[PDB]
Write an enzyme that holds these catalytic residues in place. Structure first.
Site, PDB file in Angstrom:
ATOM      1  N   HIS A 181      68.511  42.520 -14.447  1.00 37.00           N
ATOM      2  CA  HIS A 181      68.435  43.217 -15.726  1.00 37.00           C
ATOM      3  C   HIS A 181      69.350  44.435 -15.747  1.00 37.00           C
ATOM      4  O   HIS A 181      69.957  44.749 -16.778  1.00 37.00           O
ATOM      5  CB  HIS A 181      67.001  43.668 -16.012  1.00 37.00           C
ATOM      6  CG  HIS A 181      66.059  42.555 -16.342  1.00 37.00           C
ATOM      7  ND1 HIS A 181      65.275  41.938 -15.392  1.00 37.00           N
ATOM      8  CD2 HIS A 181      65.759  41.963 -17.522  1.00 37.00           C
ATOM      9  CE1 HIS A 181      64.538  41.007 -15.971  1.00 37.00           C
ATOM     10  NE2 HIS A 181      64.813  41.001 -17.263  1.00 37.00           N
ATOM     11  N   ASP A 251      69.862  32.593 -18.780  1.00 33.64           N
ATOM     12  CA  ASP A 251      69.090  33.824 -18.831  1.00 33.64           C
ATOM     13  C   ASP A 251      69.753  34.757 -19.843  1.00 33.64           C
ATOM     14  O   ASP A 251      70.938  34.624 -20.160  1.00 33.64           O
ATOM     15  CB  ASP A 251      69.002  34.475 -17.446  1.00 33.64           C
ATOM     16  CG  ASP A 251      67.758  35.365 -17.277  1.00 33.64           C
ATOM     17  OD1 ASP A 251      66.830  35.270 -18.124  1.00 33.64           O
ATOM     18  OD2 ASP A 251      67.709  36.122 -16.280  1.00 33.64           O
TER      19      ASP A 251
HETATM   20  C1  LIG Z   1      65.992  36.393 -18.276  1.00 32.18           C
HETATM   21  C2  LIG Z   1      65.379  36.302 -19.635  1.00 32.18           C
HETATM   22  O1  LIG Z   1      64.721  37.462 -19.900  1.00 32.18           O
HETATM   23  C3  LIG Z   1      64.547  35.205 -19.734  1.00 32.18           C
HETATM   24  C4  LIG Z   1      64.032  35.120 -21.144  1.00 32.18           C
HETATM   25  O2  LIG Z   1      63.426  36.373 -21.565  1.00 32.18           O
HETATM   26  C5  LIG Z   1      63.539  35.151 -18.770  1.00 32.18           C
HETATM   27  O3  LIG Z   1      62.799  33.951 -18.871  1.00 32.18           O
HETATM   28  C6  LIG Z   1      63.991  35.240 -17.441  1.00 32.18           C
HETATM   29  O4  LIG Z   1      62.917  35.243 -16.579  1.00 32.18           O
HETATM   30  C7  LIG Z   1      64.806  36.419 -17.252  1.00 32.18           C
HETATM   31  N1  LIG Z   1      65.192  36.740 -15.951  1.00 32.18           N
HETATM   32  C8  LIG Z   1      64.495  37.464 -15.028  1.00 32.18           C
HETATM   33  O5  LIG Z   1      63.384  37.945 -15.207  1.00 32.18           O
HETATM   34  C9  LIG Z   1      65.110  37.731 -13.669  1.00 32.18           C
HETATM   35  F1  LIG Z   1      64.203  37.594 -12.708  1.00 32.18           F
HETATM   36  F2  LIG Z   1      66.127  36.922 -13.399  1.00 32.18           F
HETATM   37  F3  LIG Z   1      65.558  38.977 -13.656  1.00 32.18           F
END
Ligand SMILES: *[C@H]1[C@H](O)[C@H](CO)[C@@H](O)[C@H](O)[C@H]1NC(=O)C(F)(F)F
Length: 339
Positions: A181, A251
């Site tokens: 993130h 993602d």
């Molecule tokens: C990326 C996105 O937020 C999506 C949709 O909201 C999630 O399903 C996904 O889990 C997310 N990625 C993560 O949480 C991580 F762990 F890769 F950072």
């Protein structure tokens, strides 16, 4: 009309004119909901109804993993355990863990479908190495065999309510240290090391795996591109070596790890070219609208087949009927006693 490659979100608890414009755009294929789109069940059901009224072929999804990732936790939505909790139960009683996992999946899917939602972005298939804080208790277990069988049991419960699933974050977010993130994580292991453990659940699940979200992680010995932008990971490994034919959702492209060397649109183009069937643009619908209109043209027929297969199957009980169903009540009682 047919689904486009873009999953975005709406501005509030009721649809706006701007939302309706975006939902009618040919390149829109999905809506992802977050906590801010939920006030209560009545409001949520009205919202999903109004979304489908604009775009009947739309796919509506949400992050309902349980534990630390569950957008709807009030007004009758069952607060589900962290998936780590099921791995801890497994270490005490394997068979009971598989029974509870199915009950969780059924509760999860049945409650979402009562509010007109197609799918949840679950299960996490990342292994619990302990290295990743962003995953943390979202992982089932350390052992890929245990993750596989617990995830399969969960997906079975989802299927009982006609709901699909989506494993993540391929090929594995559990070994890298950083949070995608806010940073760009890296994983310096060999391909064979990654395939032996982190990818094995994707391969072993077979038809019980309906879709995949790739991680925004750079596996430096395999490809310099993050997995979601990597033809090697998505086509050579996932589609080729593994023969996977389910949907691939990127993602969230709004994440820091997804900002490569240009615009959101160029990132979307890159993810789709790499092998994603859909791209997610979260928390900035005007930026998503630029992606919708700037997206480079591409062959989409094979993608559309996979996207439509993520729609929930069959009829769904409404809340007034689900709350009295013996199977729902049985699952609720199992969750309360086993954990
Ligand atoms: C990326 C996105 O937020 C999506 C949709 O909201 C999630 O399903 C996904 O889990 C997310 N990625 C993560 O949480 C991580 F762990 F890769 F950072």
């Amino acid at each position: 009309t047919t689904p486009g490659p873009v999953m975005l979100d709406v501005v509030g608890t009721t649809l706006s004119r701007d939302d309706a414009r975006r939902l009618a755009h040919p390149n829109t294929g999905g809506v992802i909901l977050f906590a801010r789109h939920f006030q209560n069940r009545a409001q949520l059901t009205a919202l999903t109804d109004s979304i489908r009224a604009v775009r009947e072929d739309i796919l509506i999804a949400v992050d309902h993993e349980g534990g630390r990732v569950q957008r709807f936790r009030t007004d009758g939505f069952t607060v589900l355990p962290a998936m780590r909790r099921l791995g801890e139960l497994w270490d005490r009683d394997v068979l009971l863990a598989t029974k509870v996992a199915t009950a969780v999946g059924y509760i999860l899917a049945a409650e979402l479908r009562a509010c007109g939602i197609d799918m949840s972005f679950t299960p996490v298939l990342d292994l619990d190495y302990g290295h990743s804080k962003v995953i943390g208790d979202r992982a089932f277990h350390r052992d890929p065999r245990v993750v596989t069988l617990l995830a399969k049991s969960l997906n079975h419960g989802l299927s009982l309510a006609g709901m699909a699933n989506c494993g993540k974050h391929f090929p594995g977010h559990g070994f890298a240290e950083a949070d995608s993130h806010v940073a760009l994580p890296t994983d310096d292991r060999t391909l064979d090391a990654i395939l032996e453990q982190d990818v094995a659940p994707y391969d072993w699940l077979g038809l019980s795996l309906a879709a995949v979200i790739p991680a925004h992680v750079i596996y430096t010995q395999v490809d310099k591109r993050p997995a979601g932008f990597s033809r090697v990971w998505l086509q050579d490994i996932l589609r080729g070596k593994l023969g996977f034919t389910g949907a691939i959702f990127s993602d969230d492209l709004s994440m820091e790890a997804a900002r490569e060397g240009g615009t959101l649109t160029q990132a979307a183009d890159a993810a789709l070219a790499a092998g994603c069937d859909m791209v997610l643009v979260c928390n900035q619908p005007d930026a998503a609208e630029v992606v919708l209109n700037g997206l480079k043209a591409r062959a989409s027929a094979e993608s559309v087949r996979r996207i439509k297969r993520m729609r929930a199957r069959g009829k769904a009980l409404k809340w007034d009927k689900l709350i009295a169903q013996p199977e729902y009540l049985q699952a609720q009682a199992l969750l309360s006693s086993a954990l």
